């Protein structure tokens, strides 16, 4: 594990999709350092800019190897490598919004390699996300556990709102490794994601985020 | 008389996307057809996309694939979608429209925009 996964680890993403209709793809590259769990990311809107929608919906899809975890907590997704590990999650969006996302991360040539796939659907038209009054996500606890051969997590995630107020989804994601290795027990794992630069239209965005597991409570 | 008013334009990296935009008022001839031309320097002015009322589209060789051209009619505004673009996508984008007639399957439209620069770098 820690010959392959180095104290430094670059990656590249594609992300191909859809919200209410609208299709776009980014191409992205990213670097961090896997052990302390500590990434930044830069991407770019190759296709369908300007997205006309917030991009605050995509940033959480751009990298779950950059977990910081405790010796006695096994580290499922790092062990996964290198053939890697994919997920799918449900974004649930307290106005009815739904994002579907599926994901595939593996190890090519010394890089983490993600390929993305993402649905957006039933955004109120006068919503927050397609009028773009989003202004970046609160620190989250996702609560994980294991449940049928997989690695479960469970968000109660919030954005903040441009004129006052806050913005809700209900996030549940499925982490499978592409080899049986060990599973943990339940834990949690603290994260913040911030976007720390982006041009007038959002078609070049860079973020950064940090990302701890723990014992549970 | 229709009054074609542009948008969007302005300054790209090459492999970026960017999308224009331009909004249609007055009058409206029935079959109305709208397009998007450009011209770069030292140049003559070329065709890049047409859109007919009934949804047929035309797309020059050079942006095939990479370009499209849509109507949204309740906002009155069409829409040059541009992918993927490159260096020789640098131009003065003009738009145009007339009927199916005059615009659409002929090169001799009615009414044109003001012109917006897009520059690729």
């Known amino acids: 594990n820690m010959a392959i996964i180095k104290e430094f680890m670059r990656f590249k993403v594609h992300m191909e999709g859809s919200v209410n209709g609208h299709e776009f793809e980014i191409e992205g590259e990213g670097e961090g350092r896997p052990y302390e769990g500590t990434q930044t990311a830069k991407l770019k809107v190759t296709k369908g800019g300007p997205l006309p929608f917030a991009w605050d919906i995509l940033s959480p899809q751009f990298s779950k190897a950059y977990v910081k975890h405790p010796a006695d907590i096994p580290d499922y997704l790092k062990l996964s490598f290198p053939e890697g590990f994919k997920w799918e999650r449900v974004m649930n969006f307290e106005d009815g919004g739904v994002v579907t996302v599926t994901q595939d991360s593996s190890l090519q040539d010394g890089e983490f390699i993600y390929k993305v796939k993402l649905r957006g659907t039933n955004f109120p038209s006068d919503g927050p996300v397609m009028q773009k009054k989003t202004m970046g996500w609160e620190a989250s606890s996702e609560r994980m556990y294991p449940e049928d051969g997989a690695l479960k997590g469970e968000i109660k995630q919030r954005l903040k709102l441009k004129d006052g107020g806050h913005y809700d989804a209900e996030v549940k994601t499925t982490y499978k490794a592409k080899k049986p290795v060990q599973l943990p027990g339940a834990y949690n794992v603290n994260i913040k994601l911030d976007i720390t630069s982006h041009n007038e239209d959002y078609t070049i965005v860079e973020q950064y985020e940090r990302a701890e597991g723990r014992h549970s409570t | 008389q229709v009054q074609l008013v542009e948008s969007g334009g302005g300054l790209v990296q090459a492999g970026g996307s960017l999308r224009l935009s331009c909004v249609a008022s007055?009058?409206?001839?029935?079959?109305?057809?709208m397009a998007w031309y450009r011209q770069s320097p030292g140049n003559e002015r070329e065709l890049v996309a047409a859109?007919?009322?009934?949804?047929?589209?035309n797309y020059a060789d050079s942006v095939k694939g990479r370009f499209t051209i849509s109507m949204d009619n309740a906002k009155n505004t069409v829409y040059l979608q541009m992918n993927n673009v490159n260096a020789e996508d640098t131009a003065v984008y003009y738009c145009?429209?007339?009927?199916?007639?005059?615009?659409?399957?002929?090169?001799?439209?009615?009414?044109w925009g003001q012109g917006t620069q897009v520059t690729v770098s």
């Open positions: 145009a429209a007339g009927d199916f007639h005059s615009c659409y399957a002929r090169k001799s439209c009615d009414y």
């Open positions: 007055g009058s409206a001839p029935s079959f109305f057809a």
């Open positions: 859109l007919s009322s009934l949804g047929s589209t």
